[PDB]
Amino acid sequence: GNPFQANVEMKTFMERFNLTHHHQSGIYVDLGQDKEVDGTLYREPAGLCPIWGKHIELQQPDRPPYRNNFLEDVPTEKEYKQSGNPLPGGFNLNFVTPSGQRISPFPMELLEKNSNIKASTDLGRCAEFAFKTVAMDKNNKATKYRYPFVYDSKKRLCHILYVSMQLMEGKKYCSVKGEPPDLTWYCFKPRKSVTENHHLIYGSAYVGENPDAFISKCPNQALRGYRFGVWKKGRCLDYTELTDTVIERVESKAQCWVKTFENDGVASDQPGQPHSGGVGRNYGFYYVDTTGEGKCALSDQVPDCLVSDSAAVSYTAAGSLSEETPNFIIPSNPSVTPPTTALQCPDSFGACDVQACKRQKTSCVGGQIQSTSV
Ligand SMILES: *[C@@H]1O[C@H](CO)[C@@H](O)[C@H](O)[C@H]1NC(C)=O
Ligand SMILES: [Cl-]
Ligand SMILES: [Cl-]
Ligand SMILES: [Co+2]
Ligand SMILES: [Co+2]
Ligand SMILES: [Co+2]
């Protein structure tokens, strides 16, 4: 009776929101796997979806030589000796080829021209590049450890991050703006900003295993005009009707989008199972309460239906603030189904929910599926 599971076109579309199914790992901190280097088992990011706007914010001293930018090269021994504690620089792999050719960041133009790179989108080409890049051990032998990446979609640069850590905190473990001075590491944590670094896309290398998969399987963009919901008692209940939903006031829809990533319940693999598998309070929407206040509803329930609401926007921890598809995830061949028709289009009513005294109404309006309770 659920229209969003009724026809396959609808089902397929709704699948992209199931981060347990496709992404399958932590989002805030992604450490879903473990791989051996130099006889040592290291935690490895593993998630299959790109995480839009995610960046790692550093807490280095606010002064030279420190840049507080995780895309800077990992420091050389000499740079570290020059700075003293904490480590300066960032997370970027600083290695060069036997030629002396820099490995990261790597320009998308060269990946586009590399016949061995099969992905059909620039974001996919970066992920594939990361998937085909493995850590070399102390004996310069290949391992199965793959570094995570950041795609800089503005500069069209693919960063391979030698530092795969995503969160460190506590004065026992790391320093904030140089205090305690005895510690090697500065503190850092993942972040999404209402205004900054929307052009940065974080991912595990395993986004690149089947590079074109994220296009259909991942909730890359915000969804305008609908509230996420769950099919219960023959109708679609948006999150505000569920008991375990967190509802909070926000000043803007972008604050809500940030909350779906930064709230304490988001899928995360950090100590800090320790393997979330993608389970978590990853889902939310902005809406306007009857009193006119902007609010944000957050849930760990994977949506399986939608409720129409022209003033709402549904977000996930994985996706972007924008509802608009950017050109760097539109495939350059016609075989791969593009990311964007699923919700276009008889007035259908459903059995009365006596418990709430409302009924489903599934219709078509403005060439677009309506779904509400009456
Ligand atoms: C989401 O995916 C998981 C894993 O495949 C599955 O167990 C669950 O039933 C799915 N839920 C929805 C709402 O599709
Ligand atoms: Cl001290
Ligand atoms: Cl001391
Ligand atoms: Co699936
Ligand atoms: Co593990
Ligand atoms: Co923006």
Author numbering: 69 to 340, 361 to 428, 431 to 435, 441 to 469
Manuscript text:
Supporting these invasion events are binary complexes formed between the apical membrane antigen (AMA) and rhoptry neck protein 2 (RON2) families that anchor the junction between parasite and host cell. The apical surface is comprised of several loops from DI framing an apical groove, and a single extended loop from DII (DII loop) that packs against the side of DI and is stabilized by three tryptophan anchors buried into pockets on the TgAMA1 apical surface.
Importantly, a comparison of the apical loops that frame the length of the ligand binding groove showed a maximum deviation of 0.91 Å with an average rmsd of 0.35 Å over 13 to 21 Cαs for the six DI loops indicating that minimal displacement of these loops in TgAMA1ΔDIIloop is necessary for ligand coordination. Overall, truncation of the DII loop in TgAMA1ΔDIIloop appears to faithfully mimic the displaced DII loop form of TgAMA1 and thereby present a mature ligand binding groove. In addition, binding was detected between TgAMA1ΔDIIloop and TgRON2L2D3, TgRON2L1D3 and PfRON2D3 in the micromolar range (6.0, 46, and 1.4 μM, respectively). However, since the presence of the AMA1 DII loop results in a more selective receptor, this substructure may act as a structural gatekeeper to restrict formation of unproductive AMA1 complexes.
